[PDB]
């Protein structure tokens, strides 16, 4: 039917510039507004800028103006939100929305994710969480940028009772996670239980055997 | 500069009980420009409620909405295992079209208490010049917890991270992960680390704890 799909997000340093771009298609894009709404991890959702369907009126959150301008051409059916300036506290889901004829925000954007940090990629350092009826054994993996890193157990051999926690991000910008595994303890000298980490972004896929 | 107050923070119910959740306005809002919106999780919202009652197209009928003024009301009168969400309000067609900050509806079950494990910081991670010590608290309910670290039961205090796991999908319950971080130097310095743990489910607080080299 009426689908927003969304293209430009990405993982830049603070101070610089990237543009979002939200295609339309399903209904005549230039009879509605539209709007970017931003949702930073783990925090609620926030309303960044709106546009008219002729142009000729943006409005935007004080957060963000003077350094994102929101802009349409419905000739060829698309949103735009130019950002410059950008700060750490940008971080955040964006998505295009749609004001409906009544009002509310009807249908909206998949989301893209735009992380802003001076970081730069650098993959994880792996260490075992030994043990010593039920024993636990875990993996830290620590000191990594940016997000998503991939822990699996005997390369996916082994799911019951993994938990990997989310990641929690350091005052260095890096990122720093644990996953652990509960096992029976009859199994510690038997089984052998190697960590799986894999980060894309950094090229380094690396195994850990965890042993008391 | 109005404020969207949504209560409570959390709401903790059982599958096919009734869910009410409330959003209290900073000032009313006279023309009921109120939306309600469903995000699951990891998921773009979707629109639920708007005009403060009116149901949005394609939305099933346990949802519905109610009040005028200040106050606002969402009902889920049957609680899906897909209604358990979060939700937030929002008032539209006016300045800044501000959001609520979103009530989470998360599965009730009965209170379980955790497992505690201490993890000692690996040779490895001490070759490198850091020491990370690991307490994890396994499977509990709910997710209120506290963790005190104590090295040589002195107690420490802005030292320490915790992350959370999501509700379980196959016993709704919660693991917690501590790491106290601490020069190498001072882990060298010091004998016994021990990690306490108090919750809901347990009578006393749980110890568990190591003597460095042993």
């Known amino acids: 039917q009426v689908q927003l799909v969304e293209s430009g997000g990405g993982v830049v340093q603070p101070g610089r510039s990237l543009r979002l771009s939200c295609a339309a298609s399903?209904?005549?894009?230039?009879?509605?507004?539209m709007h970017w709404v931003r949702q930073a991890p783990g925090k609620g959702l926030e309303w960044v800028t709106f546009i008219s369907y002729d142009g000729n009126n943006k409005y935007y959150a004080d957060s963000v103006k003077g350094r994102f301008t929101i802009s349409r051409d419905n000739s060829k059916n698309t949103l735009y939100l130019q950002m410059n300036s950008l700060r750490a506290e940008d971080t955040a889901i964006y998505y295009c929305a749609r004001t409906g004829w009544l009002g509310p925000f009807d249908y909206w954007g998949q989301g893209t994710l735009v992380t802003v940090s001076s970081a730069s990629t650098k993959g994880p350092s792996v260490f075992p969480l030994a043990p010593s009826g039920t024993a636990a054994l875990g993996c830290l993996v620590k000191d990594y940028f940016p997000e998503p890193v991939t822990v699996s157990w005997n390369s996916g051999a082994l799911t019951s009772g993994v938990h990997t926690f989310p990641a929690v991000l350091q005052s260095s910008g890096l990122y720093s996670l644990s996953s652990v595994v509960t096992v029976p303890s009859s199994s510690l000298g038997t089984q052998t239980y190697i960590c799986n980490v894999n980060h894309k972004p950094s090229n380094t896929k690396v195994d850990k055997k965890v042993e008391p | 500069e109005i404020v969207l107050t949504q209560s409570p923070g959390t709401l903790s119910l059982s599958p096919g009980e009734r869910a009410t959740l409330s959003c209290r306005a900073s000032?009313?809002?006279?023309?009921?420009?109120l939306a309600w919106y469903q995000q699951k999780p990891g998921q773009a919202p979707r629109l639920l409620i708007y005009?403060?009652?009116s149901r949005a197209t394609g939305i099933p009928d346990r949802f519905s909405g109610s009040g005028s003024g200040t106050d606002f009301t969402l009902t889920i009168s049957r609680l899906e295992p897909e209604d358990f969400a979060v939700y937030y309000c929002q008032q539209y067609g006016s300045s800044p079209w501000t959001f609520g900050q979103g009530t989470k509806v998360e599965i009730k079950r009965t209170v379980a208490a955790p497992s505690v494990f201490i993890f000692p910081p690996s040779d490895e991670q001490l070759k490198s010049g850091t020491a990370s010590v690991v307490c994890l608290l396994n499977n509990f309910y709910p997710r209120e917890a506290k963790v005190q670290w104590k090295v040589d039961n002195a107690l420490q205090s802005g030292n320490s991270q915790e992350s959370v796991t999501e509700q379980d999908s196959k016993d709704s319950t919660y693991s917690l992960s501590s790491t106290l971080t601490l020069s190498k130097a001072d882990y060298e310095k010091h004998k016994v680390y021990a990690c306490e743990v108090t919750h809901q489910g347990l009578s006393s607080p749980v110890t568990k704890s190591f003597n460095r080299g042993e």
């Open positions: 399903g209904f005549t894009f230039s009879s509605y507004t």
């Open positions: 000032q009313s809002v006279g023309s009921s420009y």
């Open positions: 005009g403060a009652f």
